[PDB]
Ligand binder design. Structure first.
Ligand SMILES: Cc1cc2nc3c(=O)[nH]c(=O)nc-3n(C[C@H](O)[C@H](O)[C@H](O)COP(=O)(O)OP(=O)(O)OC[C@H]3O[C@@H](n4cnc5c(N)ncnc54)[C@H](O)[C@@H]3O)c2cc1C
Ligand SMILES: O=C(O)[C@@H]1CCCO1
Ligand SMILES: O=C(O)[C@@H]1CCCO1
Lengths: 979, 977
């Protein structure tokens, strides 16, 4: 109460001394102020304006600029009044808004302007614009930019008089702070920063951070480590902890902690405890956090718990609480209050006074070019105020710029409420804990048939220590299970044959995982007869009961998630994330197709004529042959088999030879679920022995196939014949290849495009039907794009997938390795090799990560599916040729485009006619419901797994029509057209 | 108001009526009897009413102890689940209830009881139970029963004193009425009574009615012609008018008019005017009407205007207004008031007084066994009461029995309100005209397009519809002799290869010559469709749909004309021709709405920072290979489906219906369809058949025809040739070998004409036609006797003559092949019926029924596609289902059964694409019965349903990452915070 009254009064004095002055961004007399004002009034404009700011620096020609302006804002008559002559004026206004937030474009300019800040009474923390670097070379340039900055400041600082204080050392700012203070972003220091390779990322970042830190120490300066997105939070904490311990006696090292994270109370507490345990001192810059929108979207997309508070006052309350904790611990922890919020600043000031904290233990910081009246008020009241002063160019600084625009204009922004909305001061200065209680209470004021709605199973989350630790443990566990013989499974019984084929670790072929029995035509004949005998009872089973078996199987897989994943790492060479996502997709199919059968399972009345009932409903076809691929050995198999099973068919299942153990997991899961015998039959076998036999058989009514075009087309041809005794015309559900292109338009965001294209091309060694095998790059952006793509590629390592440090590993088997390598030779003769990775020496089916330029549509590697880590780079003269080239193959599965032109995106949506088109992201990793997968042309037959049309393909519709009139009367039904 | 004053008298008379009989209830409402209890719970519980009434209907066919016991449990549950109120007991109660409404089971017993009624002071009008006869012999039995009855009464009437009256002849009832009075039901006199053959029906009925009336006049009696369902109303009026004019001086001939008909105000005026014109007198029995539930349902099933009033008080108001009109005309029109309604009766009594009507001009009539206190009431006040006294067996009387039961228990029933509902007397006796206004005023309390409704079937109750066909057949004959060219890329292309098309019922009548496309022309059409495809694909789905709606309006305007062409070109009967055209219109209307439904991309998934849209794309060029049997409908269905989904079409019509194929050209042209979107290429299959199917630019084949051709196309289409963009999509409807199962408890009066239509409708030239009838052992001999007796009544001949049931088959080849099958069939089983055919030209095959057929027989397996019906004898219900499922087809099926267990088994196990319960297995309508099957009958595509258009397209997904530099637009359906 009493402290809170002091805080409120301090805040009132603050607003009083501000004298009504508005920060420049809220100055309606300025163009910037007008543009932000309209963005705040009109959400559609805000979206257009911020997106235009983002794309602006890549509008490097007059044509690009004129066209983009028209497409984002409309013609001159239809755009707002505050908005060729037009190109020049708008360019000037955007340029000036960007310069608003930086102290310079270069090191020498920054240094000049920093001395100007000192004369106005301001300290600085200098930052070089950049984040999320794309290569080792770029990380080196960023690093050397700091070294150059430090050399320059080293020369200058001796001539700088220390900013005024009340005591201490006259050569230091305010008597105590080092005059040179810099901030560094960890993700700018290493382009593959990923907690999936936790130690690898820590070391690579720490190594460059150390070089910078040594130079900082050399001039008695301060180094602060910025905090970035939640994905890197633990990595960054570890870098700080390690670096601190190597130089335990050096006081001027800081770390950012974000009060908007639910983790932060524990993290702050742990860090303080850690500092005590090691008897070192630390420094914390407490912020709220800059990535709120991003964290909420990212967690939502992956069914992760949202790592940030979601009521704005909760972050404010957390800040006051955590700042009090830091101030109390001022002996061990130096404090930088980083906030533009007058309530927050006032709370810190009164808490510090109440605890009599020495002034050398806390200072205040704000962002350069923002909240100008607040900055001046702090200078007047506290005296110790530091500006975060970045420098550099618009492209690497674009994230920063957009974050500032977002920060100032958000509905919940303290600055917007104060300086745009004329919000009441009492409300603004209210204790946010009160606000929290009131908001939470206001906020305290679906599925079908008892089932929760569909949601995709949450992705593995390597920000968690337990998830990181799970893989090595489960891989070892799997290693105790090697060397078994896997029999056929037919009508609930194991059937052994004497033709065994070993399955091996593609990254270590001498490691034999097991031996697989092969079915001959006799055993396949037996599986078909078993399925046919089980069919009548299974068909007569209630759809909701059939769905329940899928639900139980899903729960069985969920309880074995990491175990099932580890099997794939070893048997087929999946990377950890790839393995896990394979299993979660299996679970999704089970959960989704169960719900879909429940939805489609109730007969629907059709028509509304009285005296008549028509019910429309579906019947299964009979026995389904399911011929599964090796590249998604649990997901796609389970997808195809469970769809066929849930719709009332019985299945004869042929796993791919090299992933037959994963195929055995379907036996384990369906057994665990209690599935009646004969409904699922497991029959691996040699295609050359029983492949045609399975497909030609008269008792097969349906064939679900996922694999190569040559095989799919053969199956389609053979299946069309009706043999004697054959009950139905065979239904084909087929997913075949792709030759997938991603287009890189002139205006593409290259920082997004590059890592997305690399992942699309080389994720899982390129062994996906959706993989990017052609990247088609617009003439004017080509050299910039390919230099960055190649440079990022050179940073990646090729090696065993059980080691998370490797980006990709060996391909499926010896035949694939030989085939892919020959294609790379073919490609190297057609075009010109741009990159060819090292591979480890010794055993393993390794193919280099390979990038080839100069490719044209008439070349073999622009047409034929390689199914491996071979990327063709094609140079298009204009957007029209890029589309024509994207459409130049016989396939139409997936595709992508990086572009920020509304016109080019619309042209792409219309003409780039693949089954799944991706805009501004990778073209792989389709999720159930979100991205139903499949295409036409030579890529398939227009069936889409994971979508609402899929189960229909496994059934035939029936209608029963009843005349309900007997002797002149009929019951009246609710949906009848009557009188 | 004068009207307020007269109403006061009516209400006061009603009140005294109610007071005198106060206490007394009709037998049916006596809750102390079994009759009363069953009715009581029926009135309380609508679910029980349906069970009981349906049970009464099935009861007489429960002829063994097993059938009886099982049905009892199936209709009413187990011994503990059913109400307190065995087989021998329940049999006796239901039998007692049926006897409540009859004066006897035999003529002798009837005559005895009628004499007993006279001595109680009641006149009678005697009826022989029965309606909707199934044969000429049954019609003769019925006619002779009246004759036998009349001969008996001729002998008895001499000894009868007239019922007491006020003056006149003591030998006449009340001094003036003839002692003998019978009523006859017209539809009991002719098994094929149908306004489609209006003249033939009138004459057939008139000839038997005359034979009866002559006997009636011979004893100076009265003949009343009952009125039946709306379908036969005009026929019945015309029979009455003709008979009346033949015996213009004989006064004892009456007709019933139904006040529940909207037509009745006009019908009554016309009849009164017709009588004045001809200077005859008439007699009208005015009733409300007995077929209300039926007329309402039937009208709605066919998109016809409901012929009855639908607010109950509107019928009461109609009755009082029409009664007044009759009484005003008492000098020319004798009046029988037939109602159990005290308000209605009281109104007629005061009106007869107000208008000073002589007593010999009106009498009162009620139904035997009903409304006993109202009956006694009338006898006491008016004295002139006549009971409608039917006699006969329960099976032909079942319609009458169920109508009585419905009558007494209905919600709006006056009897129910008065004697079970304890309703306020003031509300019961209020002027129905006031009730009408109250009820009407009480009822006052997808994107521009009307919802889908099927196009109204032709309605031969209308004189204009009856006149339309001869007019339009004649108009079509003035346009014969033309040469029809190909239609490619908007241009007519002639070739030198011509095939003539002729009238199958008269092959010397050539309708035209058709140009045949060679492979060069087919190639050109395919090239044209391919060239038009990009722009058509990019045309908005709503815009595409608009062409179909325009084409529908074009056809709707040409309905009778388009029908006429089919009558002459492929031997369609009038109804069959019209139905073919309305189905085409339905497809157009339905597929337009479907494309509009499917045409919008839909967001899928709910993750923020992401938009996934799911939508459809056309395939490219579609080959449409159409059949002759449904020449406009199925052609238009496949073609418009392909076109509305953004494909372009190369269309090959069947050779013998090439002119109907040209109609598609005309309709799409009138709609303004872009050139090349639809191309018309008749040609010889042996020249361009495989060429069309094999062509690398074809992406989809829609085929409807024989299994053999269908399976060939599926084989060839599976190959991917050089330059072929897609795996070809097959949409295919092939044949069936369809069975109807006649269960032990089947209603044979429904089943027989339904089976006959199913098998011989359009000469059996439907993929849905019944070619096997599977009859349960114990009912076999009875079913076949009735089936054959009805068949023998039908005539085979030219479809342009509506008197004929069926006519010539499609062409010479069809004729030859069907005849070979008939001979094979005759060797396998035993012929039960083989109709005559006209001598002279025409592709005539006899209506043929063959017995002793088993599943191993060729005609039990192979689709004949002609008028040849196999009858098979199943030993029990399980073998029946087994046999139904014994072919390689699964298109349609039927079952006539009233057993919940057996119907349940059939729904589950009789796995055809379209299963029909208790009706014919043909005539599938758009939306109501989406049509198609699997096995060898098809590939699981159902034309006319909500899954069909999907087959003509491929789905596409666009996914957009909407986040830039850490922010994204929040969308409405985003999962968020
Ligand atoms: C001697 C005799 C002979 C008859 N002959 C024939 C005949 O040849 N053909 C024939 O069709 N009928 C005939 N009827 C009439 C029929 O059999 C019923 O007896 C009669 O319709 C019942 O009318 P009501 O005045 O007795 O009873 P009410 O309860 O007054 O009237 C019931 C009648 O109202 C009508 N009705 C019920 N619901 C509605 C509604 N929602 N909207 C509009 N109207 C409704 C029906 O016609 C129904 O029968 C005859 C009746 C008698 C007494
Ligand atoms: O990059 C950002 O947006 C914040 C502000 C300063 C550093 O971290
Ligand atoms: O058959 C019937 O239901 C009516 C009643 C009397 C005759 O016609």
């Amino acid at each position: 109460s009493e402290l809170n009254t002091k805080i409120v009064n301090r805040g009132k004095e603050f607003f009083g001394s501000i004298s009504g002055e508005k920060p420049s961004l809220f100055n309606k007399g300025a163009w910037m102020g007008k543009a932000m004002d309209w963005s705040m009034q009109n959400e559609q404009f805000k979206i257009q304006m911020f997106r235009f700011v983002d794309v602006f620096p890549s509008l490097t020609t007059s044509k690009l600029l004129t066209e983009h302006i028209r497409e984002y804002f409309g013609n001159e008559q239809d755009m707002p009044a505050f908005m060729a002559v037009l190109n020049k004026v708008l360019t000037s206004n955007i340029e000036e808004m960007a310069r608003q937030f930086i102290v310079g474009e270069t090191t020498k300019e920054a240094v000049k302007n920093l001395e100007k800040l000192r004369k106005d009474g301001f300290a600085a923390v200098v930052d070089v614009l950049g984040e999320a670097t794309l290569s080792e070379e770029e990380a080196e340039v960023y690093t050397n930019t700091y070294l150059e900055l430090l050399e320059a400041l080293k020369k200058e600082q001796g001539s700088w008089k220390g900013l005024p204080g009340k005591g201490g050392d006259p050569g230091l700012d305010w008597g105590h702070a080092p005059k040179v203070n810099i901030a560094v972003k960890p993700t700018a220091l290493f382009c593959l920063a990923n907690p999936q390779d936790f130690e690898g990322s820590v070391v690579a970042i720490l190594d460059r951070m150390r070089r910078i830190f040594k130079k900082v120490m050399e001039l008695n300066g301060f180094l602060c480590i910025d905090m970035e997105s939640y994905r890197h939070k633990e990595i960054i904490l570890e870098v700080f902890r390690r670096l601190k311990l190597e130089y335990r006696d050096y006081p001027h090292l800081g770390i950012v902690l974000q009060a908007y994270l639910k983790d932060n109370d524990k993290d702050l507490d742990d860090l303080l405890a850690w500092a005590k345990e090691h008897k070192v001192q630390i420094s914390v810059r407490l912020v709220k956090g800059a990535y709120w929108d991003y964290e909420t979207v990212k967690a939502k997309q992956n069914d992760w718990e949202v790592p940030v508070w979601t009521i704005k006052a909760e972050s404010d309350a957390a800040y006051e609480r955590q700042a009090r904790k830091i101030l109390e611990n001022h002996q061990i922890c130096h404090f930088a209050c980083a906030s533009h919020n007058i309530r927050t600043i006032s709370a810190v000031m009164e808490m510090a006074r109440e605890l009599n904290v020495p002034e050398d233990r806390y200072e205040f910081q704000v962002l350069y070019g923002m909240a100008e009246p607040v900055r001046k008020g702090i200078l007047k009241v506290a005296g110790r105020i530091r500006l975060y002063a970045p420098y550099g160019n618009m492209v690497p600084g674009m994230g920063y710029l957009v974050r500032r625009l977002l920060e100032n204009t958000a509905n919940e922004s303290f600055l917007r409420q104060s300086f745009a909305e004329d919000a009441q001061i009492e409300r603004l200065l209210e204790d946010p804990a009160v606000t929290v209680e009131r908001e939470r209470a206001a906020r305290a004021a679906k599925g079908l048939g008892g089932l929760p709605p569909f949601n995709n199973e949450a992705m593995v989350d390597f920000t968690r220590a337990d998830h990181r630790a799970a893989f090595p443990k489960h891989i070892a566990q799997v290693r105790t299970q090697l060397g078994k013989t896997y029999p056929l499974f037919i009508n609930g019984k194991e059937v052994r044959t004497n033709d065994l084929i070993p399955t091996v670790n593609p990254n270590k072929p001498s490691e034999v995982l097991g031996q697989i029995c092969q079915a001959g035509t006799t055993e396949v004949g037996d599986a078909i007869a078993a399925a046919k005998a089980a069919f009548p009872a299974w068909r007569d089973t209630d759809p909701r009961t059939r769905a329940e078996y899928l639900l139980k199987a899903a729960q069985a897989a969920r309880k074995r998630l990491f175990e099932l994943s580890a099997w794939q790492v070893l048997e087929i060479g999946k990377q950890w994330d790839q393995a896990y996502a394979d299993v979660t997709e299996a679970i999704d199919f089970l959960e989704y197709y169960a719900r879909e059968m429940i939805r489609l399972g109730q007969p629907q009345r059709v028509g509304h004529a009285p005296g008549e009932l028509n019910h429309y409903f579906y019947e299964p076809k009979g026995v389904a042959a399911v011929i599964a691929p090796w590249n998604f050995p649990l997901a796609i198999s389970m997808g195809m088999a469970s769809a066929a099973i849930v719709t009332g068919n019985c299945v004869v299942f042929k796993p791919s030879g090299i992933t037959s153990i994963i195929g055995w997991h379907l036996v384990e899961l369906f057994r665990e679920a209690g599935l009646p015998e004969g409904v699922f039959n497991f029959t691996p076998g040699r295609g050359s022995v029983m492949g045609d036999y399975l497909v030609d058989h008269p008792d097969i009514s349906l064939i679900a196939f996922t694999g190569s075009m040559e095989t799919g087309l053969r199956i389609i041809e053979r299946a069309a014949k009706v043999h004697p005794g054959q009950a139905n015309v065979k239904k084909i559900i087929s997913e075949m290849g792709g030759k997938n292109a991603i287009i890189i338009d002139d205006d593409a965001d290259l920082d997004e495009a590059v890592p997305h294209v690399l992942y699309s091309a080389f994720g899982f060694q390129g062994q996906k039907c959706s993989a990017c095998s052609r990247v088609i790059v617009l003439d004017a952006v080509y050299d910039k794009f390919i230099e960055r793509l190649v440079s990022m590629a050179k940073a990646t390592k090729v090696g065993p997938s059980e080691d998370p440090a490797n980006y990709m590993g060996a391909v499926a088997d010896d035949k694939a390795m030989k085939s892919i390598k020959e294609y790379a030779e073919i490609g190297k003769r057609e075009g010109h090799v741009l990159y060819e990775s090292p591979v480890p020496a010794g055993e393993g089916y390794f193919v280099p990560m390979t990038i080839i330029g100069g490719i044209k549509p008439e070349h073999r590697i622009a047409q034929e599916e390689i199914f491996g880590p071979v990327l063709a780079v094609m140079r298009a003269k204009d957007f029209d040729q890029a589309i024509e080239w994207a459409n130049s193959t016989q396939f139409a599965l997936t595709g992508g485009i990086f572009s920020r032109s509304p016109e080019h995106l619309a042209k792409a949506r219309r003409e780039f006619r693949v089954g799944n088109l991706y805009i501004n992201r990778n073209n792989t990793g389709a999720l159930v419901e979100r991205q139903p997968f499949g295409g036409a042309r030579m890529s398939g037959v227009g069936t889409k797994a994971g979508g609402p049309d899929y189960l229909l393909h496994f059934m035939d519709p029936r209608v029963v029509t009843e005349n309900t009139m007997r002797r002149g009367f009929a019951p009246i039904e609710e949906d009848d057209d009557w009188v």
